[PDB]
Ligand binder design. Structure first.
Ligand SMILES: CC(=O)N[C@H]1[C@H](O[C@@H]2[C@@H](O[C@@H]3[C@H](O)[C@H](O)O[C@H](CO)[C@H]3O)O[C@H](CO)[C@@H](O)[C@@H]2O)O[C@H](CO)[C@@H](O)[C@@H]1O
Ligand SMILES: NCCCCCCOP(=O)(O)OP(=O)(O)OC[C@H]1O[C@@H](n2ccc(=O)[nH]c2=O)[C@H](O)[C@@H]1O
Ligand SMILES: [Mn+2]
Length: 272
């Protein structure tokens, strides 16, 4: 098979995104016949250079996940990606750890396939334009750049939250993400710091192409704003040296291969 074209010729650009209707995953699976068990897809007519594992930090967000799958699967296929969806479900009911789950996703997805690109996406963010590539570039890529909840612009120029893509080497270079940001906030800023401290800069699509919708939701319990976050982001340069992939442990309790995604339920513990 020849290589897929550098830019997909299948894209349609701007899309209409709605979250006001029920979603039936069995139906979504039917509308996406080429997506195989575990939520895996690769074009059958050409070889994609983008081997992407899409990692979603998760707990009690099934409804949001249905909308995510409904919208992203058609988009990822049009982008001609060789991809897999991984929902990292945090076991238990103790304080949430978004970034540690993302590290779990990276390490566990690599056991499935030789992925060389990682998209880290919150479960409630949907792209409004398929020209917004869900794959990696020569520099870390910030994808959800113009979110409606931020008035369709970046909240601040160093904002790197929501959805991003790091190549395998970029991720390894920064020793992955921090494992000690328990509760809401700051971990995305820490990741931004890591990239900068390793000589990288943030690549971004323009604001129109990067328009993204956030599914309005209320505060989840067990993920209260971390009071130590401002302090932690000020010491990233030093802490990234020993806190991340090289200090990660966890226990996978279960791996479920659904038609549209693989769900890894994992025990990531509590603060130490
Ligand atoms: C650290 C953190 O909470 N980051 C989230 C981010 O919040 C921003 C943060 O800005 C701080 C102010 O600029 C202050 O003057 O100085 C400290 C120095 O470390 C900055 O970190 O906090 C304010 C107030 O809470 C917030 O309005 C800023 O947006 O917001 C992101 C979007 O919600 C979130 O993803 C980051 O994790
Ligand atoms: N109107 C009240 C404002 C609600 C503020 C709650 C903070 O909202 P956001 O900054 O969007 O963060 P969030 O959506 O709660 O967390 C980000 C991501 O973590 C994941 N997440 C977080 C908490 C939780 O219980 N379960 C879960 O899956 C999910 O992928 C989510 O999209
Ligand atoms: Mn949210």
């Amino acid at each position: 098979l020849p290589a897929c074209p550098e830019e997909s010729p299948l894209l349609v650009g701007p899309m209409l995104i709605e979250f006001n209707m029920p979603v039936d995953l069995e139906l979504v699976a039917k509308q996406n016949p080429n997506v195989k068990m575990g939520g895996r897809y690769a074009p059958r007519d050409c070889v994609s250079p983008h081997k992407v594992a899409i990692i979603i930090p998760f707990r009690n967000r099934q409804e949001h996940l249905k909308y995510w799958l409904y919208y992203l699967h058609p988009v990822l296929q049009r982008q001609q990606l060789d991809y897999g969806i991984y929902v990292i479900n945090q076991a238990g009911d103790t304080i949430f750890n978004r970034a540690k789950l993302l590290n779990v996703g990276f390490q566990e997805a690599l056991k499935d396939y030789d992925y060389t690109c990682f998209v880290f996406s919150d479960v409630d963010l949907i792209p409004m334009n398929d020209h917004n590539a869900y794959r990696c570039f020569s520099q870390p890529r910030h994808i959800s750049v113009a979110m409606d909840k931020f008035g369709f612009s970046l909240p601040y120029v160093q904002y790197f939250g929501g959805v991003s893509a790091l190549s395998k080497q970029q991720f390894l270079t920064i020793n992955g993400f921090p494992n000690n940001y328990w509760g809401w906030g700051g971990e995305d800023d820490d990741i931004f710091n890591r990239l900068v401290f390793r000589g990288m800069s943030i690549s971004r699509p323009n604001a129109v192409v990067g328009t993204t919708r956030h599914i309005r939701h209320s505060r989840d319990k067990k993920n209260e704003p971390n009071p130590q976050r401002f302090d932690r982001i000020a010491h990233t340069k030093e802490t990234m040296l020993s806190d991340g992939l090289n200090s990660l442990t966890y226990q996978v309790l279960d791996v479920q291969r659904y038609p549209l995604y693989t769900q890894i339920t994992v025990d990531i513990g509590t603060p130490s």
